[PDB]
Amino acid sequence: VVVGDRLVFLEALEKRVYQATQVPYPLVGNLDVTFVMPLGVFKPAADRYA
Amino acid sequence: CSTLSLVRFLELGLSVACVCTKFPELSYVAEGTIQFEVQQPMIARDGPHPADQPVHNYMIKRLDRRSLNAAFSIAVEALGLISGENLDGTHISSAMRLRAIQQLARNVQAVLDSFERGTADQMLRVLMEKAPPLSLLAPFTLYEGRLA
Amino acid sequence: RAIQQLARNVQAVLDSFERGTADQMLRVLMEKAPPLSLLAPFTLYEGRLA
Known part of the structure; x- marks a missing residue:
């Protein structure tokens, strides 16, 4: 294929290799995030309002 | 006076689903089977992972019995x-x-003529039994070799 | 028999030793590759990091 101004390969190695074998594919990565949530804070008198 | 339109199982498009063959001794045969032998490939491993081995497996499916x-x-x-x-x-x-x-x-x-239609119906009857729903199959392939 | x-x-x-190298290449290139998202802005501020 061509992208931008370059000519480059474009491959999938699921069917030729790794198919019907017990090794996971090393392209399925693993992102990691960390969530926070304050539990029992109390807002001051100014910003309590309907 | 009406006529009758004939149909033949071989000229339908459905025939390409199954292999038909005559067998004039089917009435005597006991449970007939078939055998399977497949070989799974293997890729080498490095460092931490342990050294895998080649695997073989043998399997046999069994016959059904029906009539018309x-x-x-x-x-x-x-x-x-x-x-x-x-x-x-x-x-x-x-x-x-x-x-x-x-x-x-x-x-x-x-x-x-009724047996041609009967066979064309029997094919659908049996095929509508092994087929699982697609919705339950697409999310299956994405997780193969991993339900350990 | x-x-x-x-x-x-x-x-x-x-035959295992071919898929072996085909897997090793991916396994080694993965570690060497930083994510693009963390590189595109890094390349617009080059030479300013003094």
């Missing part, structure tokens, strides 16, 4: 005329023997 |  049938009753009032026993010599009796023969031929023409 | 089995076994084990 029809019914072909014929009346006595004409059966007498068929064999020729009650067949008296007139011009009013042969005219009825012709009618009985034509009736029997029409009936047999109808029943014999 | 035993010879046939040994042959069919070694022909599999030998």
Whole structure:
């Protein structure tokens, strides 16, 4: 294929290799995030309002 | 007077689903089986992972058993005329023997054709049994070799 | 039969070393590759990091 101004390969190695074998594919990565949530804070008198 | 349109199982598009073959000894055979032998490939490993081995497996599926049938009753009032026993010599009796023969031929023409339609239906009946729903199959392939 | 089995076994084990390198290449390139999202802004501020 061509992208931008370059000519480059474009491959999938699921069917030729790794198919019907017990090794996971090393392209399925693993992102990691960390969530926070304050539990029992109390807002001051100014910003309590309907 | 109406006619009858015939169908043949080989000229349908469905035939390409299954392999048909005659077997004039099927009535005696006990449970018939088939055997499978497949070999799974293997890729080497490095460092931490342990050294894998090649794997073989043998498996056998079993036969089913079904049938097909029809019914072909014929009346006595004409059966007498068929064999020729009650067949008296007139011009009013042969005219009825012709009618009985034509009736029997029409009936047999109808029943014999019924097995082609029967097979075309049996194929759908059996195929509609092993097929799991697609919705339950697409999310299956994305997770293969990993439900350990 | 035993010879046939040994042959069919070694022909599999030998074939393993091709998928081996094809897997090793991915496994080693993955570690060397930073994510693009964390690189595109890094390349617009080059030479300013003094």
